[PDB]
From a paper:
[name] (EC 2.7.1.40) forms a tetramer that catalyzes transfer of phosphate from phosphoenolpyruvate (PEP) to ADP to form pyruvate and ATP. The catalytic site is located in the cleft between the A and B domains (lid domain), while the C domain harbours a canonical AMP allosteric site. The allosteric site binding for G6P (sugar monophosphate site) is adjacent to the AMP site and lies between the A and C domains.
In MtbPYK, the AMP phospho group is H-bonded to residues Thr374, Gln375, Ser376, Thr379 and AMP-loop residue Gly457, and forms a salt bridge with the side-chain of Arg351 in helix Cα1. The adenine-binding site for AMP is relatively hydrophobic and is composed of residues Phe373, Trp398 and Met425. These residues form stacking interactions with the adenine ring of AMP. This unique ‘synergistic allostery’ suggests that the binding of either activator is able to initiate the movements of both Cα1 and Cα4 to a certain extent and consequently reshape the allosteric sites to favour binding of the other activator.
Residue numbers in the entry:
A (entry chain D), B (entry chain C), C (entry chain B), D (entry chain A): 2 to 472
C-alpha cells in the first residue's frame, strides 16, 4: 500500500453527513483544522468526527490545528463579492466603512502609515494585483493592474513591505488554547519568520499545561533565510506554497520546496508539501497534467506528506481529490520508493542504528522493519531513508500513533509499556500475529533499546522470526 | 540567458497585429501551427508573420506543422455549446444530424460498430466522462457519469477500444503537402503508434520532393510500448500529455514523461514536453503552484523544449504565459543546468568527441563551445549533455538554424560552406567578433571535421583564442 | 598493536633453550611443524615448548602440522652428494640403485613413463636445472643446463608435467595420525590439486576420531585453476610461493597471490602468504629492500597471516626475523588497515550482521567490536573486512582460540558456555574489565545470537557501555 | 610489448665485449653510470658501447650519470681490510692516519663535533653496526654491536644525525663536467635534501654551457619531508631504497616508495624505483619470491621505471636479470596497465588535452595515441595516466628521445621541425607506415599544437586514419 501520507483540510465541503468518515476510508492520514475560517462549534464537531472515524476504521488519523498567524485581510463587501477590473481605482482603508467595489477595509491598521506610492498589493495569493498611487489619510488609493474577482475577507500580501505584527495574535492564542484543550495532536504556525517563534508557541503550551509537536509553515522570505535553524527548532515543516509564491517570486518556489524537503529529511523532521497540488479539482473531477506532475514530483523529492486545501475544504470533489492524490502517489511508489540521498552519513546513535537496521532488513529480505519509539525519533530517522519494506513503529504512548500519521511510510502499534527488550519483542509478535498479513516464521528486523521507557536509549537490533525461539 | 527552448502554439489569440512579433521578442523559439484548427489562409498568414519576426529580430524561430492525425471528434451543436450534466442520457451518432444537447454526430464512423455497453467515452481530454449503455443502430446511447460543458468539434477518446484509422488521413496528407510547400521546418505527427509511421510521412515528403525533420507525438500506449524504436526512427519526440493522460491513466504520465526525455537524450534526439504546463494562464495572469512546479521539473528532467498550447493559441495572456515560462526556466537554470546522467558512455565518434570537447571547455574555463554541423547531429550530441557554457552551432545550411531552435542551449550561426577546417575556424572568429559579447583573446573550444561538407566527418577539437595565431 | 598474524616454522634453529618462548614473546601467532624434516621426538619436544610458552605468556599460539604431500625426490648417492656441472649427462632412474654422479634413483616411479625429451627437471626448486634428452627403459637421460651440488633425497620438480600421485602418501597418513594424536590445532596439505583432496584428509581424521581445520597449500597449476572450489572446500589456504614459482612461471606468482588472497577474503577463509618473505635474514641481521616491500605488500593485499620458513627454522636470526616482520606489518597498519574492497555485498545472515556491526562500531567510535562465535565463522566474516577497531572474539571452545590465531586482527577470549545473550554480554564485561586497557563506561558493539550455543544463530547487535545497565 | 622502463647499471660485469649490446637487445632503456666507482676511461668506453648499441639496434637508450654526492666514507687501513667483531672497541677519527683495526679515519671531518654517545654508525648499509660511547678530541670511540669485515673507503651512515655537507662535492663537480662534456642525457644527484640542491647542479651546467634533466635521488629523511617541493624543482625522482632504508627505518620505505611514485605521477615527472629489486640474482640465475613480488608491485604502484644495480654492474647474471625483470613487468601489464588514480582532475591545458586524448583513443579503439612534444611535457602528462594503447611521442629534438626512455609506455620518433600541424600529421603517417605494425586506414589520435615549434602550444586533438584524406 501507499507509503507517502495525505493531509486534508476540513471545511464546508466536509461537513455534510459521513464525509469525514469517507475521507478516512479513502486514505486521509492527517486532518487539518484551519483556524482562518469557521467557529469553535465547527471545529469541535469536525474534531469529533475525525476521532470517531479513526476509532471506527482503525486507521490512525492525526489532527493538525493550523493557526492563522499575522494574516492581512480585506474586510467585507456589500454583496459579498465584487470584480476589480484592470484600470479601476480602488481604495483600501484602515478606517471603518461598508465595503463596496470602490472602497473596502483592511485588518492591517498600519497599511496607510507604511505604504508608499509604488508598493504592490496582491490579493488572494495573486489573483488580483494593485499598485499604490497615493495615501490620502486612512485610504490607500490603488490602481488595479491585474483584474479579477475579490470577495469578503480575502488575504492580501505586501511583498517587499516589512510587515509589523506579532507571530501569535490574541486570536491565535485563543485558538491555540482551544485546540490544545480540545485535544489536537499537532499545531502549525503560519508566517514563521524566526526559530524563536517556536518559543512563543511553547509559552502558551506550558501555561495551559500541554505540549504537542509544532510545525513551522514556510511562507516568508525570512523563513527561507533561516531555514536550517527553523527546521532544527520546530518539530516539522510545511512548504506553504500559496503564500510563499506571493511573498517570493513564484518562480523561486520549486527549488525552495526541494531544499526544504531535503533539509527536513537530513534532520529527521517531517515535511508536508501544501497548496494547489490538485487545485483544478476544486471544480473539476480530474486534475490537469501539471497537477499530476506536481504530486508525483513532490513524492520524488522525498516529502513525508502532501496536503489538500480547498480541494477538500470547499471544493466539489473532496473524495475524488483524495483518491486521485493517492493513485498518483502509489503509481510513483510502485516504480521506486527511492528518495534523494542524504548528504551526511548518520552520526547519532539512533541514526546509525536505524540506518544499519535498514541495511540488514533489505539484504536479508525481511518482511518488515520494526522500531520501538517513545518520542518518534528512532522511527523518523529510519523513515527518512525510505525503504520498500514496511516500517512498523511500536510505542506505549497513544499520541505517538497520531503524530506518526504524518511520517513517511509508517504505521504505528500501541502496546503496553514494557520492562525489558525481550518483552518488547514478545509484544511485536503478539501484535503482528493478529494481522492477516503476518504469520509465524516471518522474518523481521527489530530495533529497540534499554533502559526501557527511556527516550534515546535505542541500542539493539534483533533479527527475529515471528513466534520462533530465537531471543 | 535562457538555455531551455520554448514552443508556442499560434491561433486566434496570436492573430492580432504584431502579437507574433511580440512572442518572438519575448523568447518563442518554435511556433507550432496546429492543423486541427484554422484555414490554409490562417496558417499562411501566421507562417509569414513568424518569418518576418525572425528576420526582423534576428532570432531563430523554427516553424513546426502539427498534423491532426486520426483524431476522433464530436460534430457541431445547435448553439455551439451545451452542458452534459451527470445523470443525463446522450446519444452519439455516426449518422447525420444537427447536434443538440440530446444527440450529436461523431467523425468516427465505426463508433456504433465497435462500441459495447460498458465502454468509456472521455470528452475534451477527460473534462466530461460517459459510459455506453447500449448501441441502437447508428446511435451510441450513453450516460454522463462526470458532467461538464461540451462544444462543437471537441475530441473524444475511447480508452480500451482498439481504434482503426490510418496514421495519416487524406486531410493530413493535404495539410502536410501544404506545409512542406509553404516552407515549414519540421512536422509533428499526432497519435504515433509504430516506428513505421515515419515511413508514411517520408513517402509524402519524397513524392513532394522535400524532407524536413519528423517529430513523433507520444500520446498512445502503443507509442510508449515502442518508445525506443520510435525515438530511433523519428527525428524528435513530443510528450503530448493531454491525450496521453486520457489514453493512459493520468497517474502514469509523470514517469512516462521522464522515461521519454531520458530516452531522447541518450539518443541525441530533441524532446518537447507539451500541454497544460501553465494551463490556468488561459484565464489567469499568474499560474498555480503546481504549474510552476511542472515547468521547473520538466527542466530538471532534461527536456530540450517546453510547449505552450491554449496558453498562447486561445488564452487571454499569451505574452505573459511565454514570459512566465521563461522566468521559471531561468530560475532553475541559474541554480544549475545539470540533467540526469546518461546511462551509456558515448560510443560514436561524434558522441565521444562532443563529450571530450565539453570536458576540455569546462576544465579550461572556455567562454564557449563551438561545433560545426551539417545535419545538427554533432551539436545535438553535445547539447544533450547540458553545460553551463554557451553552445554555438555553426552551419552552412540555413534550415539547420531553424531546426536547432528546438535543441537545448543552442544558438546557430550561418556561415559559408568552407573547404578546410582552418577556414571553418576563421569563420568562427569573424562571426563571433561581430557580437558585442566576444572579443579577441577569448578562449573557445571548437569542434569540426574533415573532409569538409560531409555529415559525420567530425574529427577534430581545437582550443583557440579568438583572432590569435594558434591554428 | 599488530593486527596481521605471523606464522613461524620450527626447526634446528628454534631447538636451543628458550627460543620457542622468545618467539612467542616476540609475536609468533602460529607455529608450523614441517613434517618434511625431523623425527616424531623432535616434533613432540617442539609442540610441548609451544604449549608451555602459550600458557605461560597468555598469548594464543596455534600449532599447524604441514604434511609433505606427494613430493618427488631423488634417492641416495654413494658419496652422499655430488656436483652436477653444466654440460654433463646424468640419468635419473626409476629403478633402485645407490646413486653416483652419473645415475641416481627417484621416488617417482612413473618418471620414465611420463617424461619426454624437452621436459625440464629442476632440483632443489631451481639451483640445478636439467633437460630430458631421451628415455631408455627405466632411465631418464638428461643434460645439465644449470649446474650445482645435489645430495641425498633432494626434491625435484617437473614443471609442465602432469604428475599422477595420491594426495596423501603413506608417510603423510602416519604423520597426520601422529599430529592429530599429539593435539595440533590445524593441518596443511602440500601440493593440493583438487577440492576432493580435502575428503582424503577428512577420511583419516574420521577414522582417528579428531577433525581440525585443513589448509590447502597452493603450489600447483591445478590448484590455481580450481582456486575457488578449493577455497570453498578447505578451511583456509596458503600461497606456497616456493613451489608455486617453479610449477608456474615465477613471473605469474604475484598476481596469483593477490587473486588467492581476494578469493579467501570473499569467502571468509583465512589466507597465509608463505616463503622467502625475508629470505636474506637466514644469513643477515636486516632484510633486503625487496623483502620489506614484499611483507608490506602482502599486508596491503589483505593477507590474514604471513609466514617465516627457513628464516626461523634454520637461520641465524630467527628472533630478529619475527621482530622485523612485525615492525613492517605494524608500520603499514599504522598508516591504514584498509584492504581491497570485497566485490559483492554480503548475503548471509552472519556476513550481513558482521558488516552492519562494523558500520555501527566505527560510526559511533566504539572501543571494540566483540563477536561471539562457536566455529569462528561470525568473527571471520568481520575480520576479512578489516577495521581499525579491536576485534574481540568470544567463545566457549578453547580450540577456537588457537584456530583464530591465524585470523586477521583477532584476539580471542574463552568464557563459559552461556544460556542467554544477556549472559554472553555479562561475560564480555567480566573478561574486559580484567584488562588494564578497558574500563567501565567504555562503548563496545557486541554481536551475538540465540539460540545460544548454536552455530549460525548470530542474530543480534547490541551497543553496550561496559558495566552499565543498558541491556 | 613492455610499457614500464628498465634502468641498468654498468660496471665490471658489463665490460666484457658485446655485453652492453646484449643488454640493449634484452630491453635496457637507460644505462646508469655510477660515478662512485670506475675511472673516466671506464665510463667513456661504456658510454661509447651504449651509443653504438642504441644506434645499431634502433632502440632509444638514455644515459644517466649518477653523482656520488656527499657520501661519508672510512679512510684507508694499513692492511687494506680488517675484521670488526661484535664486542670490540674501535675509534673513527677525523684526524689523518693510515688505519688499523683499532683506529681509522673518516672523510666527514665534523664527525667528532657532531656525534654523541648513543649514535649509531652503520657501515656498508649495515652489515657492521657500531654505537658511539664517547668523543675524545678527534676520536669517536665506538663499540661494535654487529660484527663483520670492513675495508678501505667503505661508506658509513649516521642515521638520525644531522649531516652538514655541500650538495655537490668537488669530485661531483668534476664528474658532472666530465659527464656533460661526454654527452650524457640526464644526471642523478645522490643524497638530495632540499629543492635548492637543483640550483647548484644548474650552476655547473650553465657554466659548462649544457643542461640536461636532473633526477633527485630520495634517500634522506629531509628529502621525504620536502618531497613535493623536490618533485616540483627537479625533473624526475629516484626512490633510492638502499640508503633510504638505512637513513630511515627500513619498515617505512614501502609506504614512502608509494607516496613518492604517486607524487611524481601527479606532477607528470618520471619516477624510478631502485635497489635490491632482484638482489639475489647477483649470485643466482632466478630471483626469490620476494624479489618477483617487489618488481610486480612497483609496476602496480605506477613507477615509470625500475632499476638494476649490482644485478647488472657486478653480478654473475646481468642479462638474465634484465630478461627476468622484463618478464615480470610484462606479466603484470598483460593483466592490466591500470595505475592508482590521480587525486586531482587535470588543470593545465596540456594535462586537460592529454587526458581528453586518452578518453577519445580508448573509446574509439584507436591503434595508438600520438603526441608531439618539444620538451616531453605533453607526453609525460599522458604517460602518467597509463593506457593500454601505444603511446608514440613525436619530436624534432633527438635528446628528447633519450630523455623519454625513462617515461612510462612511450616510444619516440624523431622527425623534422615542421611549420604546421598538417605537416606534423603527415610526418606521423610517413614514420608509422615504415613500421610493419601500422597500415593505411589505421585509426590514431594525434595531439599537437600551434604555433609550431613552441613549448606548451599543445591545442589540438585530431582523430586520423593513416594515409586518409581526413585533415
Ligand atoms: N628442519 C630442517 N632440517 C634440515 N634442513 C632444512 C630444515 N628446514 C629447511 N631445511 C632446508 O634449508 C633450506 C631453506 O629452508 P626453507 O626456507 O626452504 O624451509 P622449507 O621450505 O619449509 O623446508 P623444505 O623446503 O625442505 O620443506 C632448504 O634447503 C631446506 O631443505
Ligand atoms: N512499549 C514500550 N515499552 C518500553 N519502552 C519503550 C516502548 N516503546 C518505546 N520504548 C522506548 O523508546 C525508546 C526509543 O525512543 P525514541 O528515542 O523516542 O525513539 C526505546 O529505546 C525504548 O526503550
Ligand atoms: N560551414 C561549413 N563548411 C564546411 N563544412 C561544414 C560546415 N558546417 C558543417 N560542416 C561539416 O559538418 C560536419 C558535421 O556534420 P554533422 O555530422 O551533421 O554534425 C563537420 O565535420 C564539417 O565537415
Ligand atoms: N560462550 C558462549 N556461550 C553460548 N553461546 C556461544 C558462546 N560463544 C559462542 N556462542 C554461540 O555461537 C554463535 C556464533 O557461532 P558461529 O556461527 O560459528 O560464529 C552465537 O550465535 C552464539 O550463540
Ligand atoms: N617535429 C615538430 N615540429 C614542430 N613542432 C613540434 C614538433 N614536435 C613537437 N612540436 C611542438 O611541441 C609542442 C608540445 O611541446 P611540449 O609542451 O613541450 O610537450 C607542440 O605544440 C608542437 O608545437
Ligand atoms: O497556508 C498555506 O498552506 C499556504 O499559504 O499555502
Ligand atoms: O497533442 C498534444 O499536444 C496533446 O495531446 O497534449
Ligand atoms: O610449501 C611451501 O611453503 C612453498 O612451496 O612455498
Ligand atoms: O643510491 C641508491 O641507488 C640507493 O641508495 O639505493
Ligand atoms: K492558516
Ligand atoms: K611440507
Ligand atoms: K652514486
Ligand atoms: Mg491557500
Ligand atoms: Mg499561508
Ligand atoms: Mg491539447
Ligand atoms: Mg494530442
Ligand atoms: Mg612447497
Ligand atoms: Mg644511495
Amino acid at each position: 500500500t501507499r507509503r507517502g501520507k495525505i493531509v486534508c483540510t476540513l471545511g464546508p465541503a466536509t461537513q455534510r453527513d459521513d464525509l469525514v468518515r469517507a475521507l478516512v476510508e479513502a486514505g486521509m492520514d492527517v486532518a487539518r483544522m484551519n483556524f482562518s475560517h469557521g467557529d469553535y462549534d465547527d471545529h469541535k464537531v469536525a474534531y469529533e468526527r475525525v476521532r470517531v472515524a479513526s476509532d471506527a476504521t482503525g486507521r490512525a488519523v492525526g489532527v493538525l490545528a493550523d493557526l492563522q498567524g499575522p494574516k492581512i485581510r480585506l474586510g467585507r463587501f456589500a454583496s459579498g463579492a465584487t470584480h476589480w477590473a484592470e484600470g479601476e481605482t480602488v481604495r483600501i482603508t484602515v478606517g471603518a466603512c461598508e465595503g463596496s467595489h470602490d472602497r473596502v477595509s483592511t485588518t492591517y491598521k498600519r497599511l496607510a502609515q507604511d505604504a508608499v506610492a509604488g508598493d504592490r498589493v496582491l490579493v488572494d495569493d495573486g489573483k488580483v494585483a494593485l499598485v499604490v498611487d497615493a495615501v490620502e489619510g486612512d485610504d490607500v488609493v490603488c490602481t488595479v493592474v491585474e483584474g479579477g474577482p475579490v470577495s469578503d475577507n480575502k488575504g492580501i500580501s505586501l511583498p517587499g513591505m516589512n510587515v509589523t505584527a506579532p507571530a501569535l495574535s490574541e486570536k491565535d492564542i485563543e485558538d491555540l488554547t482551544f485546540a490544545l484543550n480540545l485535544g489536537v495532536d499537532m499545531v502549525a504556525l503560519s508566517f514563521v519568520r524566526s526559530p524563536a517563534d517556536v518559543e512563543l508557541v511553547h509559552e502558551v503550551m506550558d501555561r495551559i499545561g500541554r505540549r504537542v509537536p509544532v510545525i513551522a509553515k514556510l511562507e516568508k522570505p525570512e523563513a527561507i533565510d533561516n531555514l536550517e535553524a527553523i527546521v532544527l527548532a520546530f518539530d516539522a515543516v510545511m512548504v506553504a506554497r500559496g503564500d510563499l509564491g506571493v511573498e517570493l517570486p513564484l518562480e523561486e518556489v520549486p527549488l525552495v520546496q526541494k531544499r526544504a524537503i531535503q533539509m527536513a529529511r537530513e534532520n529527521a523532521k517531517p515535511v508536508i508539501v501544501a497548496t494547489q497540488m490538485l487545485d483544478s479539482m476544486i471544480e473539476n473531477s480530474r486534475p490537469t497534467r501539471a497537477e499530476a506532475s506536481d504530486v508525483a514530483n513532490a513524492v520524488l523529492d522525498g516529502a513525508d506528506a502532501l496536503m489538500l486545501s480547498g480541494e477538500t475544504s470547499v471544493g466539489k470533489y473532496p473524495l475524488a481529490a483524495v483518491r486521485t492524490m493517492s493513485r498518483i502517489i502509489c503509481a510513483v511508489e510502485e516504480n521506486s520508493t527511492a528518495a534523494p540521498p542524504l548528504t551526511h552519513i548518520p552520526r547519532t546513535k539512533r541514526g546509525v542504528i536505524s540506518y544499519a537496521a535498514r541495511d540488514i532488513g533489505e539484504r536479508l529480505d525481511a518482511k518488515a522493519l520494526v522500531a520501538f519509539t517513545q518520542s518518534g525519533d528512532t522511527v523518523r530517522r529510519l523513515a527518512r531513508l525510505h525503504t520498500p519494506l514496511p516500517l512498523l513503529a511500536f510505542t506505549a504512548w497513544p499520541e505517538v500513533r497520531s503524530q506518526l500519521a504524518m511520517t513517511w511510510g509508517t504505521e504505528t502499534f500501541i502496546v503496553p509499556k514494557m520492562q525489558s527488550t525481550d518483552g518488547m519483542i514478545r509484544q511485536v509478535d503478539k501484535s503482528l500475529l493478529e494481522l492477516a498479513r503476518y504469520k509465524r516464521g516471518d522474518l523481521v528486523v527489530i530495533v529497540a533499546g534499554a533502559p526501557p521507557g527511556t527516550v534515546g536509549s535505542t541500542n539493539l537490533i534483533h533479527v527475529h522470526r515471528i513466534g520462533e525461539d530465537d531471543v
